[PDB]
Symmetry: D2
Subunit: 115 residues, 4 copies
């Protein structure tokens, strides 16, 4: 599992469950091509987005649908989504965990990169 996403809810102190995540990869013509998508589990984690073979070098965009998360809980949030854009695998394959911490008017995102 070379790409994992973990999302927490800073209002409830809980995993953010059922958060939709869409991953895109920049194509040779500079457009964002759809790459993988999924939703966070009861643990706030999303595994199985991609494989070592498919997850080649490139610029990737991880779009976390924070607005739909808050709206489903009856909350009108500020952001449309949280976007995380990064070059991956430039020095060979790595494992990436993209974490996000959500509040209605704020979020944080951190990358943990391991070899």
């Amino acid at each position: 599992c070379p790409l994992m996403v973990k999302v927490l809810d800073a209002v409830r102190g809980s995993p953010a469950i059922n958060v939709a995540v869409h991953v895109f990869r920049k194509a040779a013509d500079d457009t964002w091509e759809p790459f993988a998508s999924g939703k966070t589990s009861e643990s706030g984690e999303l595994h199985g987005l991609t494989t070592k073979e498919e997850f080649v070098e490139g610029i990737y965009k991880v779009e976390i649908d924070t607005k739909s998360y808050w709206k489903a809980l009856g909350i009108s949030p500020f952001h449309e989504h949280a976007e995380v854009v990064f070059t991956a695998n430039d020095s060979g394959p790595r494992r990436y965990t993209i974490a996000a911490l959500l509040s209605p008017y704020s979020y944080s995102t951190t990358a943990v990169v391991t070899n």
Copy 2:
């Protein structure tokens, strides 16, 4: 001044100075069109991006060039940039401050919306 951007550096404990910031507004055909841009000042702030007349309701993207900031300091960063995407909504007088707190492998962003 209905839209301000403030950027802080969590490694040096300082304003993030001379950071390029580009603002886009979502067009009818779902493309991002340039709206305003600048570089943060010595206080990490970018004022005068738009005016009340120009800053109508819609979806805006604030792209902060974090990668160039870290590279100018000789520090290896994770993200290509930090993106903040939000809907501006008219509900009484509103001023939007988009704050960002930068680390090489993490950032947070918060919206301070006041009257």
Copy 3:
């Protein structure tokens, strides 16, 4: 004004208004003695805590009463308070801003130290 405190509310996207803040200085016997205190203003800021003459080198604790803030908003919080503990060091002219970003189950704090 060598020491300022700024507090933001990540749930409402606003300054955190009327938050009690207590500053302590570490005494010779390793106890915390009261040094300054106040409540944040309508802009979430607390100025005028100390003076250059009084704010000598040493270890300081800034205790932010986050629990009372959330309870006044009818929101259930995790922490008893947020504590920020740091050494003030004289290396040229220095101004310290202690910023805090509050959510019910999470907070961040950053030091902005400028000349």
Copy 4:
């Protein structure tokens, strides 16, 4: 394992390894009594601090020795430590994960509380 601590390094995008953590519990005379201590592993996690039987109701302080962490990496940080203070088990036993995200001049802490 009713109390776990996880620490990440926002400069390196890595677990924060070998971070000392000291836990205290407020005694009946209002002093902070030592409760448990440990260090984070190669994964940035600290397990085994306490047991369900020992981890009774109370006010707990989790002190994360961030300064020694940064100093051992050759970095002079701002904070002495990161303190996390909370009432535990008030509505019956819960499992607490205290996460911290470290930068030299900033940190965040979040609590994930599960039943």
